[PDB]
Amino acid sequence: NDRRTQIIKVATELFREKGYYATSLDDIADRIGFTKPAIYYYFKSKEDVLFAIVNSIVDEALERFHAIAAGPGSPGERIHALLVEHTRTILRNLDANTLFYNLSPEREREMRKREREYTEIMQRLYAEGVATGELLDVDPTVATATLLGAAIWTYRWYDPEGRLSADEVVEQITRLLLNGYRR
Amino acid sequence: NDRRTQIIKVATELFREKGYYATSLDDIADRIGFTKPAIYYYFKSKEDVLFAIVNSIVDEALERFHAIAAGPGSPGERIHALLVEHTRTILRNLDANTLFYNLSPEREREMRKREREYTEIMQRLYAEGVATGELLDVDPTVATATLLGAAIWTYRWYDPEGRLSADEVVEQITRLLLNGYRRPA
Structure with missing residues (x-):
């Protein structure tokens, strides 16, 4: 290293x-x-250098994810903190996300394993919050993929040169998912 | 025809x-x-036949979208009906969706135009519902892309051979987006 x-x-x-x-x-x-x-x-190639860069960004993002999930607050507070962090990470690494979702089997296997870790941390955390009456009683796997999915989709529509900044988009997205669209 | x-x-x-x-x-x-x-x-090719099949499915889905948006109910009721319809259409046309988001410039231009219509119908409808106090006060463009985005992402994770059916996944997703994940205090 x-x-x-x-x-x-x-x-x-x-x-x-x-x-x-x-x-x-x-x-x-x-x-x-x-x-x-x-x-x-x-x-041995520039593509192997690009994998190393992406695996590093995935490795740090996942450490910041574990710390929040393993730290203080109720499961519903931790869920909220994880979504703000996840969306912030998406908006700051837009080309990496387009590169992540659009070659070498073992390298792909490693990417699938990291995606699984993200989902499982939030799955367990959504089940605890539902058990104690804090969160909407829906299947943990459906909530986790839908909430994370809502955050990830920003890579296809967010324009950095547009009117709204990265901070405004993260705040509104996280406020939408938390309260729902109906007042 | x-x-x-x-x-x-x-x-x-x-x-x-x-x-x-x-x-x-x-x-x-x-x-x-x-x-x-x-x-x-x-x-002139099997690819041109595949475009025709996809453009047809997009053309019918968009007619069912307009009908709901131009029909009865408040904007917040219509928003809800549009999401249930949109997600149902995704789960029924899974290969078409993977094919839609993963060649010929003019054909691509046509796909971009249909995506724009979906978004604009819902954008105007989210602005009306916010103006009357029915919907959460966030930018219409952000709400529309996030709500539709949440429905679309199902193509990457939904397993037809899994435990939950298509009806359960549509109901729970639309109930999650409507009420939010935190239960009312």
Whole structure:
């Protein structure tokens, strides 16, 4: 993880400023000051670098998710905190989300395992809140996929250059799902 | 539309029973009793037949959407009726939805135009319900994309061979979005 993290960070900066299709492994090797053979040890293609960047963003997001679910508050308060966090993470990593839902079997298997963790943390938390009378009595699997699904769909419609900011969209979405649309 | 509708129906039945990749334009022509040259006049590829099937399903779904939005009830009652209808249509046309969201510019442009109509019917309807105090005061565009988005996402998670039926999933989703997840204090 010493030079590898340095390689992921340098690659992320370089894909931002230059663009993914204009950037090669030769360019990444150049910026950190490594030879072409030296980068092969860590990464054999630019696609393997892109997987590493996405798996890192998925790994941190999932840590922030566990901390909230394993921390203080009632299940209904934790459910709310998880949705604000999840939507914030979607709006800030829009290209990563389009990349996540639109190759290598074992790498795909790893993505399916992380999706399962998100869902299961919230499933158990929705069942506890329903058992104590705090949450709407619907199946936990249906509520979890619908609430998370409502947050995720923003990647297909949210325009960063539009009138409403990321903070306004997160607030309204989370207020809509919490209270419902009927006053 | 005389033989064309017959061709779309025969192609739909044949893609169901046999499968899309195992069915050719020669097979469709055989079933209706037409020559290979005779089918070219109406359709030049199996992909063009598949577009026609999808554009038809989108065309009927959108007519059922307009009827509810242009009929009786308050805006909040119509909003509810539209969501039950929309989700029912998703669960019944699961392969069409996966095909809709995952080629020909003008054909894509047509799909974008139909998506816009759905959204605009509900946008205007959410603004009226907010203006009269019936609906939660949030931006119409955000509510509409979120509510429809919640209904659409079912195509990625709903398992027809699972424990819950299509009717239970529609009822619970529409009850969740209406009342919210937190029970009234």
